[PDB]
Design a protein around this nucleic acid. Sequence first.
RNA 1: GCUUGUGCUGUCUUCGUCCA
Lengths: 61, 263, 45, 67, 49, 113, 56, 147, 48, 57
Amino acid sequence: LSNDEVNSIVKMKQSLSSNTGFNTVLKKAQLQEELEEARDAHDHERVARIEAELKSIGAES
Amino acid sequence: EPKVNIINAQDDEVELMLSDVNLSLANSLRRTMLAEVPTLAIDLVEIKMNTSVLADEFISHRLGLIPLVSEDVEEMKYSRDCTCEDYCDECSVVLELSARHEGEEGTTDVYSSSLIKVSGPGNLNVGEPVRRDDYDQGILLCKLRNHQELNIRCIAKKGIAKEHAKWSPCSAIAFEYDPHNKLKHTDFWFEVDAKKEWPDSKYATWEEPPKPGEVFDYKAKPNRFYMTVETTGSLKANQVFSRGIKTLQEKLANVLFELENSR
Amino acid sequence: GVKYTCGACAHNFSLNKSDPVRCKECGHRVIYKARTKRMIQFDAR
Amino acid sequence: MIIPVRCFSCGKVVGDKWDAYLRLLEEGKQEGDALDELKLKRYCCRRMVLTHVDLIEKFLRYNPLEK
Amino acid sequence: STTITSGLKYSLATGNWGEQKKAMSSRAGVSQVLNRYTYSSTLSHLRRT
Amino acid sequence: MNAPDRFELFILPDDVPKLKITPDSRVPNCIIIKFEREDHTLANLLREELALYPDVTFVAYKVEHPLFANFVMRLQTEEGTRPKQALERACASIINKLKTLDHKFNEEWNIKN
Amino acid sequence: KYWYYPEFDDVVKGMYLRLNTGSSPYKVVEVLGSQRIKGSAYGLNSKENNCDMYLK
Amino acid sequence: EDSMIMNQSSIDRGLFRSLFFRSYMDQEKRFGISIVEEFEKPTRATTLRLKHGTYEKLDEDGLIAPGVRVSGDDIIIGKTTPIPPDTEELGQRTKYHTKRDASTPLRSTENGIVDQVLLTTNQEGLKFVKVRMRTTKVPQIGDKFAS
Amino acid sequence: RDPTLNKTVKIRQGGYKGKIGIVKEANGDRFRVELHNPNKTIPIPCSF
Amino acid sequence: LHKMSMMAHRVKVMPYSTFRLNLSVTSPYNADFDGDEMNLHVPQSEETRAELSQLCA
RNA sequence: GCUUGUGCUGUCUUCGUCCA
Ligand SMILES: [Mg+2]
Ligand SMILES: [Zn+2]
Ligand SMILES: [Zn+2]
Ligand SMILES: [Zn+2]
């Protein structure tokens, strides 16, 4: 397989990925980065949606 | 002439008093029971899979220290004295442990009761790991979480504590004589008064304290020796005492045989 | 011919000395070799 | 890391008393009283159980490397 | 961007706190490999002057 | 790397005798015995048994180095007796003492059980 | 091992394989093609082995 | 003189026993447009300038596997670099050298068990390996202790 | 060259009975075998 | 510091990985057993061995 | 008929060990 084919297969399985701990941590980190970008831009509307999404994804055990 | 008196008796400990024996004889008996009574212990570990958080040699060392039943180990042979190819049923005992955690949550403990005897000498009571009761779980060996498995095959061989301390049948042998210090074998350090700065021995009531007007007796020798033998469970206390006596007799008989053969 | 294991999702696969060093399913860039098949023995001391 | 099988000084088997020790401490017994209940008389054996740190519980929190 | 990137990376990697060509007659040892032999040694190395 | 095998403390090599006896010509009727793969356990027992015999005038032992498992005994007896005979008598006497000690221990254990 | 390959659609086309009838006497079927069905993820071999490929 | 006596039975039961880990690193360097180092098992026919250690513990990919015993000088990472062939095109059917050996041996004073082998790619894009060796060190005469 | 170099071997007699090893040096009958757990190499006759 | 820092000894081959000294020679060497190390030099000739055994012993 | 291969960088920097 080539690099592009491997990345396409990985993206396809990520679309198929219901949940995976490493991927959930990475998504939560990316959401936190997006949240700090929205906070630093004084966007009071986007940050509420990101907080709600983080609350839905979070609350681990 | 030698006399034995037993104070307390149990499966794993006996407290006795030896009288009319030399100090050297009692000390040699203590040393023999500590270092020269043969037992059975795991010596070779074949690891087929180990995905735990513990290193392989860590688990092997822990396995070596597990006490096994060694009642009939006198009928077994030493591995280097056995003419067999590899290991046979007359010089080794084979045990097998297979552990795994099922489920995606929680932790599983691996105990010494999970060791299963697969082969060994026919009709000899050797090989099984020691257990205090029927419901006792034994010694904690490892801990496993999900998708972690341990699968090993151990070989138990006969040996003595001179080669490695895992073969020692005893843990600690208390040993004591002359609680009132009539022989003056020790000189007591003190600040004000030696009598009231030193605790009394636990056998101080077994001997008459010296009279205030008595003078030092230079003809006396140590005569009564108090000793407690504690075992790890691999052997009973009386078995350890008898086999220590037998081992000392065998060593002396070997010396005598070498002397007579020297001619 | 040689087995590997992913550093993230612990998935097993094989490589033929021509594929990129990557996990098949999650695309991690870190993989580990599998344990050998030779006999392993210790002296329990 | 994990409770030693034998006492270092004398070799008494102390590796079968860790869970009972934790149980006794749970019930509210003092550490000295709990060690007395487990029949650990010599202070060499009491040191083994009193000063042990269970590090395997921290090592087990990392995800397994093989499945 | 390679100027700032390489300068910061070189200074932190080697400990010479200056330009790479100006390494001679420049302060050295400002950056060191973290000690990891034991936890207390790591703490001590992180609180050193 | 330089650690000797632990079984060398008690396993006797094929070419190494268990017992080597040489005379000590400085004083009359004295021998030097070299014990291989033995230690204080046998040495102290034999020495303090022999020291109580009327016909034994000198008995001693020393372990030259703790890293080597051997000891050397010096034994001197009266004109009538030979030192080797005294050593054999000492071995037999300790064996008899251990035998009666074991008998009495078994008797007392059976009584108390 | 090979369902996610882009060429697997043409590879599996026309192949003959043993199929579980379910209604079980196994029979042979001819693959007329494949069609991805989104939202129809199913366990293939284990719980984590999610697959969306379907064989017509 | 500040020496101490330690109990051998305590040492046998696990007093001051410790674990030792050492890691080795190697990667494929880029010298030209098509000149690349390769991780592989060298052969005395195709490769020149081999070492005195053994090569039988390597796998097909040139890397040792975890769980294998390693002694000093043994080869744990097999790497070769290409070399412009000599006049051996005079006829050497399968035994003309085109590679030079650049393998990584184990330290001569060390031995142990291979604990973990890591394979990945570097920032540039070539292969990158890390091998960790594990051994146990038991206290002995000449080891340093302090209160 | 002996056909036993770099091959897994087991010891059947002596003080190292039943230990797995690998043959490293073989000149005249005295095979040099490294032991898997003890980090050492020992001489041994080919008979064992 | 002085010529008693180099002296000629007689070899005794022993197990374990340390050099072993009588404790009375620790004063001229100014040595103790808390981690010190010492060097050893082997003569390679009969004349050199005689020099060591008759002058530096 | 089949035969075993024969070696290693340099220059700085830092942290340490035993004396002093
Ligand atoms: Mg010093
Ligand atoms: Zn046998
Ligand atoms: Zn993965
Ligand atoms: Zn204790």
